[PDB]
Design an enzyme around this catalytic site. Structure first.
Site, PDB file in Angstrom:
ATOM      1  N   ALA A  10       0.831  -1.194   0.000  1.00  0.00           N
ATOM      2  CA  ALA A  10       0.000   0.000   0.000  1.00  0.00           C
ATOM      3  C   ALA A  10       0.877   1.259   0.000  1.00  0.00           C
ATOM      4  O   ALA A  10       0.647   2.191   0.775  1.00  0.00           O
ATOM      5  CB  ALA A  10      -0.957  -0.012   1.182  1.00  0.00           C
ATOM      6  N   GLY A  11       1.883   1.270  -0.877  1.00  0.00           N
ATOM      7  CA  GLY A  11       2.788   2.409  -1.038  1.00  0.00           C
ATOM      8  C   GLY A  11       2.100   3.603  -1.678  1.00  0.00           C
ATOM      9  O   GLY A  11       0.889   3.569  -1.918  1.00  0.00           O
ATOM     10  N   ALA A  12       2.873   4.652  -1.958  1.00  0.00           N
ATOM     11  CA  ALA A  12       2.329   5.917  -2.461  1.00  0.00           C
ATOM     12  C   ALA A  12       1.495   5.734  -3.725  1.00  0.00           C
ATOM     13  O   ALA A  12       0.323   6.091  -3.744  1.00  0.00           O
ATOM     14  CB  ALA A  12       3.451   6.913  -2.711  1.00  0.00           C
ATOM     15  N   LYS A 205      10.103  10.634 -19.457  1.00  0.00           N
ATOM     16  CA  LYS A 205       9.943  10.985 -18.048  1.00  0.00           C
ATOM     17  C   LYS A 205      11.273  10.823 -17.328  1.00  0.00           C
ATOM     18  O   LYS A 205      11.643  11.671 -16.520  1.00  0.00           O
ATOM     19  CB  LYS A 205       8.872  10.133 -17.366  1.00  0.00           C
ATOM     20  CG  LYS A 205       8.419  10.704 -16.028  1.00  0.00           C
ATOM     21  CD  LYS A 205       7.886   9.645 -15.077  1.00  0.00           C
ATOM     22  CE  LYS A 205       7.592  10.261 -13.711  1.00  0.00           C
ATOM     23  NZ  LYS A 205       6.946   9.310 -12.764  1.00  0.00           N
ATOM     24  N   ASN A 209      14.016  13.709 -15.481  1.00  0.00           N
ATOM     25  CA  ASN A 209      14.057  13.471 -14.038  1.00  0.00           C
ATOM     26  C   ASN A 209      15.351  12.800 -13.577  1.00  0.00           C
ATOM     27  O   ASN A 209      15.586  12.663 -12.376  1.00  0.00           O
ATOM     28  CB  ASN A 209      12.871  12.607 -13.592  1.00  0.00           C
ATOM     29  CG  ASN A 209      11.553  13.361 -13.591  1.00  0.00           C
ATOM     30  OD1 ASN A 209      11.062  13.765 -12.535  1.00  0.00           O
ATOM     31  ND2 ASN A 209      10.965  13.546 -14.773  1.00  0.00           N
TER      32      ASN A 209
END
Length: 321
Positions: A10-12, A205, A209
């Site tokens: 249940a990470g970000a 992306k 980054n």
């Protein structure tokens, strides 16, 4: 149908995707360990978005066998945790299972498409090949996340900003299941967009980054302070030029110039990165992988080498590598 839906952890990102689905009225399963498991079994999955908190009943267990084969598995974990994540989600994967892989940097499966270095195993993300055998590539649908969120406490997600997701087939082009996955995410309030070559959205992306993440942890500066200082700015453009050279040779040519992309990043404000905001840093997936691809594709990488060495030692001094 896409009925049996499981989130790994249940990470970000994973927890946010899961909460959105639960909000849309889907039954959602979570494969969780430790204190996350206990929080999820007792309180539910928790989402704070738009100043409102939702408690979303989920079926959380450590036992994948009890869950069985799923229709959709959402894997949004960090690269070092994966090796011990695949073999774990073996019971969740059956013949018809779509594995939506929403991970930072270069994913293990990246090269399974026609073109340069097809099937190249990347030592930075899957050195002993254990992940690709636990999760065969025909199951996977790639996902580039363009929203932000964070974990408050175990099982509690706080949405940052945005709803944007790009989905695509590793092999390339449209497919029935790509349209169904997008529509599912669409029904959950995600603005899910479909790519014809997801590798090109992964590289784009990454390219804008790739310097910004390790630069922000080595220095501690906000993203505006990095691009204002003209000497670290010139280091960023150099690293980006190496990344673009690697990209144009692996099927992902970049149209945007490094200086123009840097103008977009500084206008976001004085906010930190995902590398800044314990836990092992994603240096391997974000930096070491690109250096590895450069070594294969012939492009020299002394700017990336310097960046990698400095940030791995910065994180090795702490408990972050």
């Amino acid at each position: 149908s896409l009925t049996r839906i499981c989130i790994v952890g249940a990470g970000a990102v994973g927890g946010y995707l899961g909460a959105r689905l639960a909000l849309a009225g889907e039954a959602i399963n979570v494969l969780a360990r430790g204190a996350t498991l206990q929080a999820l079994q007792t309180a539910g999955l928790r989402l704070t978005e738009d100043g409102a908190t939702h408690t979303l009943p989920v079926r959380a267990t450590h036992d994948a066998a009890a869950l069985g084969e799923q229709d959709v598995v959402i894997v949004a974990v960090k690269a070092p945790a994966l090796e011990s994540v695949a073999a774990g989600i073996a019971p969740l994967i059956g013949p018809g299972t779509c594995v939506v892989v929403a991970m930072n940097g270069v994913p293990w499966w990246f090269f399974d498409r026609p073109g340069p270095l097809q099937g190249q195993r990347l030592q930075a993300v899957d050195p002993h090949g254990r992940i690709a055998q636990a999760i065969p590539t025909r199951h996977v649908l790639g996902c580039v996340v363009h929203l932000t969120c964070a974990t408050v406490s175990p099982g509690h997600i706080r949405h940052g900003n945005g709803r944007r997701l790009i989905l695509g087939e590793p092999a390339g082009g449209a497919s029935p299941r790509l349209a169904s996955i997008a529509a599912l995410f669409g029904r959950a309030g995600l603005q899910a967009e479909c790519s014809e070559a997801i590798q090109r959205d992964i590289w784009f992306k990454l390219w804008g980054n790739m310097t910004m993440n390790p630069v922000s942890v080595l220095t501690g500066a906000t993203c505006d302070r990095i691009l204002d200082d003209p000497l670290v700015s010139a280091f960023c453009l150099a690293v980006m030029a190496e990344a673009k050279a690697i990209g144009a040779r692996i099927g992902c040519p970049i149209e945007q110039s490094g200086e123009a992309r840097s103008a977009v990043t500084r206008q976001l404000g004085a906010f930190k990165t995902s590398m800044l905001q314990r836990g092992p840093l994603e240096i391997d997936a974000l930096v070491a992988s690109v250096r590895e691809i450069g070594l294969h594709v012939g492009v020299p990488t002394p700017q990336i080498d310097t960046l990698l060495g400095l940030v791995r030692l910065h994180a090795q001094t702490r408990g972050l590598y």
